[PDB]
Amino acid sequence: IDPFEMAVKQLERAAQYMDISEEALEWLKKPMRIVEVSVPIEMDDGSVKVFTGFRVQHNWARGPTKGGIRWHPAETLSTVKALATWMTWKVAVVDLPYGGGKGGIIVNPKELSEREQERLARAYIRAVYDVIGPWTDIPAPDVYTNPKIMGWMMDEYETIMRRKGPAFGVITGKPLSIGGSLGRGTATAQGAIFTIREAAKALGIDLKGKKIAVQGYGNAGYYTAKLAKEQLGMTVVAVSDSRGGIYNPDGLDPDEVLKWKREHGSVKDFPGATNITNEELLELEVDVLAPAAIEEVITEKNADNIKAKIVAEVANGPVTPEADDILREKGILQIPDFLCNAGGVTVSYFEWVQNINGYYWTEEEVREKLDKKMTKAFWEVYNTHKDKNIHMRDAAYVVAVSRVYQAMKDRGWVKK
Numbered sequence: 001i002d003p004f005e006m007a008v009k010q011l012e013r014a015a016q017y018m019d020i021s022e023e024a025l026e027w028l029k030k031p032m033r034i035v036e037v038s039v040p041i042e043m044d045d046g047s048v049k050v051f052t053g054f055r056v057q058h059n060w061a062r063g064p065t066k067g068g069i070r071w072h073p074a075e076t077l078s079t080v081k082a083l084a085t086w087m088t089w090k091v092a093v094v095d096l097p098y099g100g101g102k103g104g105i106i107v108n109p110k111e112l113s114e115r116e117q118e119r120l121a122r123a124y125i126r127a128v129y130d131v132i133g134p135w136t137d138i139p140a141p142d143v144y145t146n147p148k149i150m151g152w153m154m155d156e157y158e159t160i161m162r163r164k165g166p167a168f169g170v171i172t173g174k175p176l177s178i179g180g181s182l183g184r185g186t187a188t189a190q191g192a193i194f195t196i197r198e199a200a201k202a203l204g205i206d207l208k209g210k211k212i213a214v215q216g217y218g219n220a221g222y223y224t225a226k227l228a229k230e231q232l233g234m235t236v237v238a239v240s241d242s243r244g245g246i247y248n249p250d251g252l253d254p255d256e257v258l259k260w261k262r263e264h265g266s267v268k269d270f271p272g273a274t275n276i277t278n279e280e281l282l283e284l285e286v287d288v289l290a291p292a293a294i295e296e297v298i299t300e301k302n303a304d305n306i307k308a309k310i311v312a313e314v315a316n317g318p319v320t321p322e323a324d325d326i327l328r329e330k331g332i333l334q335i336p337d338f339l340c341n342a343g344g345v346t347v348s349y350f351e352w353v354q355n356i357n358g359y360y361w362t363e364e365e366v367r368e369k370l371d372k373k374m375t376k377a378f379w380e381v382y383n384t385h386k387d388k389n390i391h392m393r394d395a396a397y398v399v400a401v402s403r404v405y406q407a408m409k410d411r412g413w414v415k416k
């Protein structure tokens with residue numbers, strides 16, 4: 001199924017639940033600027049290979065667009081457009097002065113050396129310089145892209161820009177040595193934890209000593225479990241990676257689980273825990289469940305058997321819309337996927353602010369500001385959910401589209 005068409009259908013479903021003019025919907029259904037460029041690099045053997053690069057800016061009514069760059073062999077122009085459309089709503093729901101943007105290169109980075117990767121980043125910057133900038137379009141790290149490529153890209157942009165302005169702020173996710181920001185490694189987990197705490201407050205639940213289950217034990221899942229156990233004082237009872245899963249009644253130690261996974265390549269055979277599967281984790285009876293792994297793990301097949309009371313969609317769209325309806329019917333409070341993991345883009349916004357201002361904050365200030373933003377966004381989404389009697393995902397979509405529509409109307413782009 002085409003990603004851009006799914007995004008458009010999602011937008012139309014959201015518009016069904018709110019009062020928006022037809023011209024505004026038609027404007028929002030089309031990216032405002034799409035740039036496709038050729039990216040030529042010199043290979044180590046001396047030959048020149050040309051790659052295809054994309055840079056889609058869906059909307060910039062609220063401010064400069066924001067979005068990461070993907071380096072995937074199966075990259076398409078439609079995926080870029082859909083992800084830029086999603087990024088628009090993601091930055092709108094958390095109330096940032098940002099638009100929607102996305103970039104990508106059709107390349108397999110596993111077969112590229114470090115020098116070839118640097119050449120690719122510099123050539124991409126040289127190609128898309130005319131449509132990016134500190135106040136025009138701020139790229140970010142994404143799949144198969146790391147802060148090292150961000151630093152290379154920033155260096156190339158500063159070289160082209162002749163240091164005439166805040167070249168640090170042209171791109172986020174940079175190393176701390178060059179315009180980096182603190183708390184960029186646990187941004188998603190921190191935002192998810194804040195949203196879970198706000199959900200527990202809204203449901204009247206004391207999380208102290210409660211049970212949490214985390215599916216996926218990568219960067220987001222591990223840090224989410226660790227932060228939950230530390231800050232929320234809850235009991236982490238079960239985790240699971242792509243290989244397998246483990247379950248413990250009393251509770252596990254996430255640091256020990258990560259050490260075991262590093263030692264043996266998987267979380268399986270952990271002492272004091274019973275080896276289980278991802279599925280058995282899904283129907284595990286816990287107060288909070290945080291799927292932080294491969295998307296679409298909750299479908300119609302297993303929606304009715306979910307015993308979780310709070311489902312924090314840390315991953316990108318892990319719940320099927322029919323599964324969404326089934327979970328809403330049972331009275332389970334869900335958190336929209338693009339609202340729960342909005343901590344990363346919020347911390348990227350903080351990094352951009354620090355780069356623009358030339359003044360950098362500490363870990364405590366970043367954590368406090370992230371807490372404030374996540375708490376306010378979640379409370380607004382929940383209030384819309386309760387007032388309009390619609391789904392949480394639908395409420396978040398309504399909030400984001402309403403903000404973007406108001407920004408468009410204030411600019412005079414749409415007269416209705």
Ligand SMILES: N[C@@H](CCC(=O)O)C(=O)O
Pocket residue numbers: 066067068139140141142344345348
């Ligand atoms: N948060 C975005 C990435 C873009 C960014 O962090 O700036 C995503 O994972 O979809």
